[PDB]
Amino acid sequence: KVFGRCELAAAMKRHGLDNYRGYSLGNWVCAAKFESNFNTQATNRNTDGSTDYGILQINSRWWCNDGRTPGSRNLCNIPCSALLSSDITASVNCAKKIVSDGNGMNAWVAWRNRCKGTDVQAWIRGCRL
Ligand code: NA
C-alpha cells in the first residue's frame, strides 16, 4: 500500500507514535517519506547481505527474520514479511523498540540526513489530526 501523507500521519498518531520517546509525529512521517516514499512494500538489499523492509525500512540484521541474513537477530520477534503488510501495526510496534534502544531516531539514516534539524511539523501541516 502507498499511503498518502495525512493518511499515514493519522495511522501513526492513532498507533501511538506522536511524541513517542519525545519524537513528534512529523518526524515519523518525514522518516517514512524518505525511507520508503510511503510504500509499505519497499525493500532494499544492503551490502552486508541484510535487507531493509517496509514503510520505515527496518533491517534484518537486528530486527526481523528473513531466512537469508545469517548470524542475525530478530529483536522484534517477527518475519520480515510482516513489515510489508498494508497493515502498519508490525512496523510501528517494531519502530517503537528501535527508537527506545539507544541512538533514538538516528537509527534511520534518512531521518538523520533529511529530517533531523528541519521543520518536520510541515509533514503533518493541514492534516485532520
Ligand atoms: Na534477522
Around ion ligand 1, residues with a beta carbon closer than 5 Å are 60, 65, 69, 72, 74
Q: In total, how many domains does the chain have?
A: 1
Between CA 117 and CA 18 the distance in angstroms is 17
**Known catalytic membership, residue 35:** yes
Per-residue cell: 65: 527474520
Domain span at residue 109 reads 1-129
Q: What is the CATH number of the domain that holds 83?
A: 1.10.530.10
Distance 40 CA to ligand 1 centre (A): 19
Q: How many CB atoms lie within 10 A of CB 66?
A: 18
* Alpha carbon separation from 96 to 32, 46, 68, 100 (Å, rounded): 14, 23, 24, 6
Q: What angle do CA 85, 89, 92 make, to 5 degrees?
A: 110
Strand partners, 107: none
Angle between helices 25-36 and 5-14 (to 10 degrees): 130
**Residue found under cell 521543520:** 119
Query: Is residue 72 within 8 Å of 64, Cβ to Cβ?
Result: no
Give the gyration radius of the chain's Cα atoms. 14
In eight-state DSSP terms, residue 84 is G
C-alpha pair distances (Å), 65 with each of 21, 44, 76, 105: 25, 15, 9, 22
In this structure, which amino acid lies at residue 107?
Answer: A
- The structure was resolved experimentally with X-ray
